[PDB]
Amino acid sequence: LPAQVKGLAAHINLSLSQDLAISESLANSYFIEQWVREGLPEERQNDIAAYLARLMEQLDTELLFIAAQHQGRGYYFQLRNGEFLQRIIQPPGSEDDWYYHFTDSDNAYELNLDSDTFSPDDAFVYVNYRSTVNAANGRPLVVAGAGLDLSQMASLIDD
Amino acid sequence: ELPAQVKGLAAHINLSLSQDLAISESLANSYFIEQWVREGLPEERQNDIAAYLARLMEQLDTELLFIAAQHQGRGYYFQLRNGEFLQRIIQPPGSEDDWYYHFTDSDNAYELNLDSDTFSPDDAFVYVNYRSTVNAANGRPLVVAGAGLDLSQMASLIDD
Ligand SMILES: Nc1nc2[nH]cnc2c(=O)[nH]1
Ligand SMILES: Nc1nc2[nH]cnc2c(=O)[nH]1
């Protein structure tokens, strides 16, 4: 664990004051939790996307994501470039191993450099923040946050 | 005024507003709050609004959160404080609600206003007054929202 790679990782952590605060409020959102408690009804996805789009106006991130527990399964949603994308989280051993590794930890949040699951040729530093509320299976009810490219992270280093 | 004596003081308040400012901005511009205002502030959904604010207050460690919403030309003031959801109508200019007209008449996205409280006048706070980007028909922001900070919370946020 060389000193220069601790400093880079530590320096990035200290830089993201606003993205971390919003990721925590999104993961713990009462509005999002209501939607999850209702069974993730498709009819309200436009409201969820508009809620996330409002947050992205405040932030300077490439994407916002929600990973919600429903009936024992994980449902992954993402707002990116105005499009609301969704898919089901896959079993362990597949491209969604980020979700099981984070939720198995005791960390309230983590910064994860990973390839994207909708566009694998893209990569981001994801702010994975867990909700305080857990589902019946022990997984967090909601894992949510932002995806940051290098340009946005470089602007946070300056500030 | 007198800078050098307040310069040590001034740095201390900025550490007070790193998280409280970000959440105040997201609350004022909240799509969830906006929908409620667009629906006419129906009383049936106040429990949802109060539960929504309770999540935010757990994150920030602040004494109070407030919402000042425009509806049919009048301002409606709501506050969550110590688990209680308080509400009243904003009064005309020249009264104790001059903070609202002075702020909304300005061009500032937000302001810090040291003022006595309108529900409990014996209390005072530094209020983070943040305006929504969307405006009502009268030109005032659809929503002004934010947190009220005591000295104790600011003194702790000072050390950090
Ligand atoms: N690939 C990937 N997608 C995510 N979406 C949210 N967090 C992550 C993550 O850590 N990795
Ligand atoms: N008295 C008072 N109450 C507020 N509630 C929200 N902002 C303010 C303010 O500036 N003054």
XYZ file of C-alpha atoms and ligand atoms in Angstrom:
341
model
C 0.000 0.000 0.000
C 2.329 2.722 -1.286
C 2.105 6.161 0.314
C 1.330 7.881 -3.000
C -1.762 5.739 -3.609
C -3.039 6.306 -0.062
C -2.703 10.038 -0.573
C -4.548 9.984 -3.880
C -7.396 7.913 -2.427
C -7.523 10.025 0.745
C -7.338 13.310 -1.188
C -10.299 12.258 -3.353
C -12.350 11.378 -0.264
C -11.856 14.804 1.333
C -12.728 16.605 -1.928
C -16.354 15.459 -2.339
C -18.238 17.364 0.340
C -21.459 18.029 -1.581
C -21.666 14.771 -3.539
C -21.392 12.811 -0.288
C -24.065 14.854 1.500
C -26.548 14.420 -1.354
C -25.747 10.711 -1.735
C -26.624 10.197 1.943
C -29.935 12.071 1.666
C -30.828 10.193 -1.533
C -30.075 6.769 -0.033
C -32.128 7.703 3.059
C -34.835 9.566 1.121
C -38.334 9.158 2.527
C -39.628 9.788 -0.999
C -37.570 6.932 -2.445
C -38.454 4.660 0.483
C -42.172 5.281 -0.088
C -41.710 4.202 -3.706
C -39.883 1.040 -2.577
C -42.533 0.248 0.063
C -45.223 0.522 -2.634
C -43.516 -2.218 -4.663
C -41.548 -0.010 -7.081
C -44.623 0.750 -9.237
C -43.683 1.608 -12.817
C -46.328 4.342 -12.940
C -44.212 6.497 -10.606
C -40.877 6.139 -12.434
C -41.350 9.521 -14.125
C -41.592 11.065 -10.656
C -38.448 9.209 -9.547
C -36.572 10.386 -12.640
C -37.764 13.972 -12.130
C -36.686 13.811 -8.485
C -33.224 12.607 -9.523
C -33.037 15.142 -12.365
C -33.643 17.923 -9.861
C -30.715 16.678 -7.738
C -28.447 16.500 -10.780
C -29.063 20.198 -11.420
C -27.443 20.910 -8.050
C -24.612 18.425 -8.491
C -22.027 18.044 -11.246
C -22.125 14.282 -11.766
C -22.460 12.066 -14.817
C -25.160 9.869 -13.276
C -27.236 9.103 -10.199
C -28.224 5.548 -9.286
C -30.623 3.719 -6.968
C -30.254 0.050 -5.954
C -33.479 -0.903 -4.156
C -34.485 -4.123 -2.399
C -37.851 -5.555 -3.444
C -39.155 -9.096 -2.806
C -35.656 -10.394 -2.139
C -34.226 -8.967 -5.377
C -32.120 -5.896 -6.072
C -33.412 -3.415 -8.643
C -30.881 -1.044 -10.202
C -32.011 2.326 -11.580
C -29.831 5.022 -13.108
C -30.395 8.519 -14.476
C -27.784 9.377 -17.097
C -27.925 11.963 -19.896
C -31.674 12.394 -19.386
C -32.472 8.667 -19.738
C -33.891 6.548 -16.916
C -32.314 3.085 -17.169
C -33.236 0.020 -15.131
C -32.264 -3.632 -14.726
C -32.281 -6.333 -12.063
C -29.148 -6.912 -10.003
C -27.567 -10.214 -10.998
C -26.403 -13.058 -8.724
C -22.949 -12.989 -7.112
C -20.114 -13.766 -9.499
C -21.472 -11.546 -12.272
C -20.886 -7.887 -13.172
C -22.914 -6.714 -10.161
C -20.380 -7.906 -7.567
C -19.967 -4.270 -6.452
C -23.375 -4.484 -4.751
C -22.685 -7.610 -2.682
C -19.181 -6.486 -1.687
C -20.407 -3.085 -0.476
C -23.533 -4.340 1.297
C -21.494 -7.074 3.013
C -19.234 -4.402 4.530
C -19.924 -2.282 7.619
C -19.181 0.986 5.796
C -21.931 3.590 5.574
C -20.471 4.513 2.181
C -17.597 3.616 -0.128
C -15.911 5.042 -3.217
C -15.755 2.338 -5.897
C -13.830 2.580 -9.164
C -15.772 0.264 -11.462
C -16.955 -0.279 -15.012
C -20.559 0.720 -15.649
C -23.216 -1.976 -15.915
C -25.257 -0.344 -18.691
C -22.212 0.842 -20.690
C -19.265 -1.389 -19.750
C -16.839 0.670 -21.851
C -17.341 3.568 -19.402
C -15.905 3.713 -15.882
C -16.660 5.970 -12.930
C -15.890 6.466 -9.271
C -19.236 5.607 -7.673
C -20.374 6.997 -4.318
C -22.126 3.908 -2.875
C -24.176 5.103 0.128
C -26.435 2.738 2.068
C -29.762 3.537 3.680
C -30.053 3.128 7.439
C -33.182 0.999 6.903
C -32.502 -2.630 5.950
C -34.774 -5.029 4.107
C -35.879 -8.279 5.733
C -32.957 -10.191 4.184
C -30.424 -7.882 5.869
C -29.529 -5.939 2.724
C -29.945 -2.146 2.794
C -33.361 -1.105 1.546
C -31.646 1.434 -0.740
C -28.092 1.924 -1.964
C -27.793 5.177 -3.899
C -25.336 7.847 -4.963
C -23.521 9.462 -7.878
C -21.070 8.411 -10.571
C -18.078 10.736 -11.053
C -15.722 10.962 -14.025
C -12.146 12.268 -13.739
C -13.056 15.792 -14.891
C -15.588 16.285 -12.098
C -13.205 14.756 -9.554
C -10.444 17.084 -10.764
C -12.719 20.067 -10.132
C -13.408 18.790 -6.606
C -9.652 18.541 -6.000
C -9.321 22.257 -6.788
C -12.153 23.302 -4.454
C -17.732 47.373 9.247
C -14.926 45.997 11.451
C -13.226 43.020 9.735
C -10.117 42.065 11.750
C -12.114 41.412 14.945
C -14.749 39.366 13.056
C -12.295 37.491 10.770
C -11.662 34.731 13.311
C -15.424 34.551 13.811
C -16.131 34.519 10.055
C -14.079 31.384 9.289
C -15.890 29.535 12.060
C -19.356 30.036 10.504
C -18.283 28.721 7.080
C -17.408 25.329 8.548
C -20.942 25.500 9.973
C -22.558 25.523 6.516
C -20.823 22.839 4.456
C -23.541 20.194 4.834
C -26.356 22.478 6.019
C -26.074 24.599 2.865
C -26.141 21.608 0.504
C -29.236 20.137 2.173
C -30.933 23.537 2.372
C -30.499 23.924 -1.396
C -31.834 20.444 -2.144
C -34.807 21.013 0.178
C -35.744 24.369 -1.358
C -35.499 22.880 -4.856
C -36.995 19.517 -3.893
C -39.241 18.004 -6.550
C -41.153 16.290 -3.728
C -41.842 19.588 -1.978
C -42.693 21.260 -5.300
C -45.337 18.640 -6.137
C -46.964 19.259 -2.759
C -46.995 23.014 -3.423
C -48.373 22.475 -6.938
C -51.195 20.351 -5.476
C -52.301 23.264 -3.282
C -50.494 22.223 -0.083
C -53.130 19.572 0.770
C -53.354 18.985 4.512
C -53.661 15.216 3.955
C -49.987 15.034 2.925
C -48.497 16.967 5.855
C -47.558 13.694 7.562
C -45.504 12.818 4.474
C -43.864 16.256 4.523
C -43.088 15.931 8.234
C -41.624 12.442 7.748
C -39.598 13.695 4.773
C -38.108 16.504 6.874
C -37.380 14.148 9.788
C -34.958 12.199 7.576
C -33.105 15.401 6.702
C -32.929 16.583 10.305
C -31.369 13.278 11.352
C -28.604 13.817 8.784
C -27.849 17.477 9.618
C -28.148 17.684 13.441
C -29.985 21.014 13.344
C -32.659 22.473 15.603
C -35.228 23.107 12.872
C -36.054 22.889 9.178
C -38.489 25.294 7.535
C -40.460 25.619 4.304
C -41.948 28.912 3.063
C -44.168 28.067 0.092
C -46.054 30.315 -2.327
C -49.679 29.349 -2.959
C -52.368 31.604 -4.471
C -50.348 34.735 -3.721
C -49.774 34.003 -0.023
C -46.808 32.513 1.802
C -47.306 29.411 3.941
C -44.638 28.781 6.576
C -43.992 25.280 7.910
C -41.436 24.147 10.454
C -40.281 20.830 11.892
C -38.730 21.349 15.319
C -38.187 18.707 18.025
C -40.561 16.310 16.267
C -43.414 18.836 15.984
C -44.758 20.038 12.631
C -45.679 23.719 12.987
C -47.529 25.856 10.463
C -48.754 29.427 9.993
C -49.375 31.995 7.256
C -46.721 34.563 6.376
C -47.755 38.050 7.492
C -47.687 41.255 5.406
C -44.639 43.521 5.103
C -43.897 45.597 8.177
C -44.387 42.668 10.561
C -42.089 39.985 11.956
C -41.875 38.275 8.535
C -39.858 41.064 6.889
C -37.065 38.496 6.533
C -39.102 36.787 3.798
C -39.740 39.919 1.727
C -36.180 41.209 2.137
C -34.663 37.885 1.054
C -37.036 37.122 -1.825
C -36.599 40.671 -3.150
C -32.834 40.098 -3.326
C -30.907 38.361 -6.099
C -29.073 36.036 -3.683
C -29.533 32.295 -4.151
C -29.312 32.118 -0.379
C -28.675 34.234 2.696
C -27.756 33.784 6.343
C -30.222 35.679 8.524
C -29.846 36.031 12.283
C -33.420 36.518 13.452
C -35.859 35.734 16.235
C -38.186 32.808 15.607
C -41.801 33.374 14.587
C -43.294 30.437 16.504
C -41.184 31.002 19.658
C -40.051 34.648 19.736
C -37.805 34.023 22.760
C -35.632 31.803 20.519
C -33.214 33.034 17.859
C -31.351 31.226 15.105
C -29.084 31.791 12.146
C -31.434 30.732 9.342
C -30.140 29.396 6.029
C -32.668 30.969 3.629
C -32.325 29.159 0.279
C -34.668 29.905 -2.631
C -35.997 27.514 -5.236
C -35.048 28.189 -8.848
C -38.726 28.079 -9.873
C -40.662 31.299 -9.184
C -44.364 31.846 -8.484
C -46.546 34.182 -10.564
C -45.723 37.119 -8.297
C -41.987 36.721 -9.010
C -41.150 35.330 -5.575
C -39.577 31.853 -5.292
C -42.056 28.992 -5.187
C -40.197 27.661 -2.138
C -37.798 29.143 0.393
C -36.373 26.456 2.666
C -33.435 25.637 4.895
C -32.275 25.066 8.450
C -32.129 27.044 11.677
C -28.823 26.838 13.532
C -28.272 27.482 17.236
C -24.923 28.637 18.635
C -24.165 25.162 20.025
C -24.388 23.456 16.627
C -22.393 26.248 15.016
C -19.770 25.985 17.762
C -19.374 22.256 17.057
C -19.339 22.764 13.287
C -16.680 25.397 14.016
C -14.182 22.884 15.404
C -14.670 20.537 12.438
N -20.437 -0.919 -11.970
C -20.948 -0.241 -10.935
N -22.129 0.357 -11.055
C -22.532 1.008 -9.936
N -23.685 1.708 -9.742
C -23.637 2.174 -8.467
N -22.548 1.832 -7.822
C -21.827 1.086 -8.742
C -20.566 0.453 -8.610
O -19.826 0.435 -7.618
N -20.198 -0.204 -9.785
N -37.606 34.837 11.902
C -37.186 34.119 10.851
N -37.725 32.928 10.601
C -37.210 32.310 9.510
N -37.547 31.093 8.998
C -36.760 30.908 7.905
N -35.942 31.905 7.670
C -36.212 32.814 8.684
C -35.636 34.083 8.946
O -34.747 34.664 8.307
N -36.200 34.677 10.077
